[PDB]
Design a binder for this molecule. Structure first.
Ligand SMILES: O=c1cc(Br)cc[nH]1
Ligand SMILES: O=c1cc(Br)cc[nH]1
Length: 129
């Protein structure tokens, strides 16, 4: 991709600790699966390509980018140690969108629909066993 977009967030790193948990399995099998097929998921399925979108200031503003494509790879590659790390990635993705864009913009309404779905599923995140 373009040299003007940063490398994506890390999805593989042998030095970082990781494990499976039933909560992480739920995040992949229920949470990510639900959000990924939503009508409004598509803009969130890969890193923001600020060159293609003509958003030259994006990576000046957003210093902790995150997207569902990255979260999917982190879940499928067992990158995480715990659910909190993955929930934080989702929350970063939503808050980036709300910080960068005007309230009421289409992309914000899209993120808000995904976040509504997310919160319902996270309220049912299973007890860690
Ligand atoms: O303008 C934009 C586009 C995306 Br995708 C995410 C946040 N802001
Ligand atoms: O401005 C935008 C950009 C994308 Br990508 C999706 C919705 N609105």
């Amino acid at each position: 991709g373009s040299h003007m977009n940063p490398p994506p967030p890390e999805t593989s790193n042998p030095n970082k600790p990781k494990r499976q948990t039933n909560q992480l399995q739920y995040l992949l099998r229920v949470v990510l699966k639900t959000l990924w097929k939503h009508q409004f998921a598509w803009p969130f399925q890969q890193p923001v390509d600020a060159v293609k979108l003509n958003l030259p200031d994006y990576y000046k503003i957003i210093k902790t980018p995150m997207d569902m494509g990255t979260i999917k790879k982190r879940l499928e590659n067992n990158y995480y140690w715990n659910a909190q790390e993955c929930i934080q990635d989702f929350n970063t993705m939503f808050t980036n969108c709300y910080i960068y864009n005007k309230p009421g913009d289409d992309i914000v309404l899209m993120a808000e629909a995904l976040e509504k779905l997310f919160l319902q599923k996270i309220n049912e995140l299973p007890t860690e066993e």
